[PDB]
Ligand binder design. Structure first.
Ligand SMILES: O=C(CCSc1nc(-c2ccccc2)cc(=O)[nH]1)NO
Ligand SMILES: O=C(CCSc1nc(-c2ccccc2)cc(=O)[nH]1)NO
Ligand SMILES: [Mn+2]
Ligand SMILES: [Mn+2]
Ligand SMILES: [Mn+2]
Ligand SMILES: [Mn+2]
Ligand SMILES: [Zn+2]
Ligand SMILES: [Zn+2]
Length: 455
């Protein structure tokens, strides 16, 4: 009546055989889980990675969070608690809030109460949490190579479900991005407390995320299937238009808390789950998700990109251009890097990259014909990958240039992508230069190498 819990998302319990290869598994469940946006995966009973830490030596800087529905919050960027003193604070907070033993409050009640307090103007609840990538002060919850590791640790060093390994596996596509994308390719560590919350969002470049709860009280999730992303955005834009104003950069992305019943009222499908310790949650491309912690806990999450995702990745960058949103990396640069390594690619990867590259090349061909017809005649090869990211964004749409751009000696260092030739300066186009990474004659052999590898 006050809060009606969304229907449960799918839960999978793979056999060790099914589980072993995360990429095969995710591909298998995809027709089901992409309809719900998120799903939960329970590992085989004896898949049990070792969790061991000195709570007195793990330190982190706490972030502070107000809990008001529809209020703007800023996406996190990469004071001090130890894990012990954070834990003591967190447990006392929850215990005091409910006047109940810290681990005896029903999950249904915490959820109900979360949605009450965020919607009540009178209530001014603030909580704290940890969020950052692994560091010497607070390392991964999974085993990593370095000290003498136990045999138990050794066993899980190379697991496909060890989140440190996920990015660099063979069927991962984000693997050999040579660009610095630490915030995206490295796992994030999250230390939660009762009500600490992550606002509604999708992943950068519409990637997947895989999320593991190492220990502690459950994490409550809400998820929306990718097909309803724009429906959700329209609902939010109606209720919180200030979140949709143009953002100056990626450090000023605005996100918010919003009751899933509000989405369900507006015919947006929403699913829920309680993720418990030892369980995975997977989010699918462009699947909006949000959630909050039931209590003191420790989670680890990483983005990843399969071959299934490649065409969506291209669509996402198109979408970013139309919205004038900054990119985390150049999709075309990633594609060309993979083509340049065609001989060592997994063959299914090679086949899928070939297809995206074909689209890339035909789009590039047409764009170059168009700018030639606008009077741009001079050209010069340019190694875009050498430029700092913030030195090769299109002045107009902020896209990260790689295949080509237009420059003018009138505006030293400024670039526009080929969609925005008219947005650079008032000089006539014959003053312009087409800067290009590859000629069309360079590109066809690169694509052919992929075809040969794919056989
Ligand atoms: O969750 C399961 C069965 C997982 S397999 C499964 N799940 C759903 C499904 C589940 C939740 C929401 C929407 C669809 C539909 C289907 O055809 N198969 N175990 O408890
Ligand atoms: O988005 C997710 C869920 C990861 S689980 C999580 N995320 C945050 C969080 C997320 C973003 C910024 C700040 C905190 C806090 C927390 O306690 N848990 N994976 O795709
Ligand atoms: Mn306890
Ligand atoms: Mn996320
Ligand atoms: Mn425009
Ligand atoms: Mn703008
Ligand atoms: Zn542009
Ligand atoms: Zn000029």
């Amino acid at each position: 009546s006050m809060f009606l819990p969304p229907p449960e998302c799918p839960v999978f319990e793979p056999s060790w055989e099914e589980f072993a290869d995360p990429f095969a598994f995710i591909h298998k469940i995809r027709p089901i889980a992409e309809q719900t946006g998120i799903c939960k995966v329970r590992p085989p009973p004896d898949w049990q990675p070792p969790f061991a830490c000195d709570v007195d030596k793990l330190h982190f800087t706490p972030r502070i969070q107000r809990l008001n529905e529809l209020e703007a919050q800023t996406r996190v960027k990469l004071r001090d608690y130890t894990l012990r003193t954070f834990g003591e604070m967190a447990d006392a907070f929850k215990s005091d809030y409910f006047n109940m033993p810290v681990h005896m409050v029903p999950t249904e009640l915490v959820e109900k109460e979360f949605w009450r307090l965020v919607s009540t103007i009178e209530e001014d609840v603030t909580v704290e949490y940890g969020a950052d990538i692994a560091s010497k002060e607070f390392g991964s919850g999974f085993p990593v190579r370095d000290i003498k590791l136990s045999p138990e640790e050794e066993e899980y060093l190379d697991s496909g479900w060890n989140l440190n390994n996920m990015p660099v596996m063979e069927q991962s596509v984000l693997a050999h991005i040579t660009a610095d994308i630490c915030g995206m390719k490295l796992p994030w560590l999250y230390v939660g407390m009762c009500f600490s919350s992550f606002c509604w969002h999708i992943e950068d470049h519409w990637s997947y995320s895989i999320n593991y709860l190492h220990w502690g009280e459950p994490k409550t999730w809400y998820g929306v299937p990718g097909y309803a992303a724009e429906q959700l955005e329209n609902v939010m834009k109606k209720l919180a238009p200030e979140l949709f104003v143009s953002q100056p950069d990626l450090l000023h992305q605005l996100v918010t808390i919003m009751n899933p019943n509000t989405l369900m009222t507006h015919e947006v499908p929403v699913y829920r789950t309680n993720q418990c310790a030892g369980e995975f949650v997977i989010t699918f491309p462009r699947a909006y998700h949000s959630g909050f912690n039931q209590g003191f806990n420790f989670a680890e999450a990483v983005n990843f990109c399969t071959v299934d995702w490649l065409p969506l990745g291209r669509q996402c960058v198109e979408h970013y251009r139309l919205l004038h949103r900054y990119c985390v990396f150049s999709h075309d640069e990633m594609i060309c890097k993979m083509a340049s390594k065609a001989d060592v690619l997994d063959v299914v990867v090679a086949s899928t990259v070939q297809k995206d590259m074909a689209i890339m090349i035909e789009d590039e061909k047409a764009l170059r014909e168009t700018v030639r017809k606008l009077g741009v005649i001079d050209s010069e090869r340019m190694d875009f990958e050498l430029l700092p990211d913030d030195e090769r964004q299109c002045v107009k749409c902020k896209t990260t240039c790689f295949m080509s751009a237009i420059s003018c000696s009138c505006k030293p260092g400024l670039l526009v992508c080929l969609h925005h030739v008219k947005e650079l300066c008032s000089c006539p186009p014959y003053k312009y230069k087409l800067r290009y990474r590859y000629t069309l004659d360079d590109l066809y052999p690169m694509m052919n190498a992929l075809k040969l590898r794919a056989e």
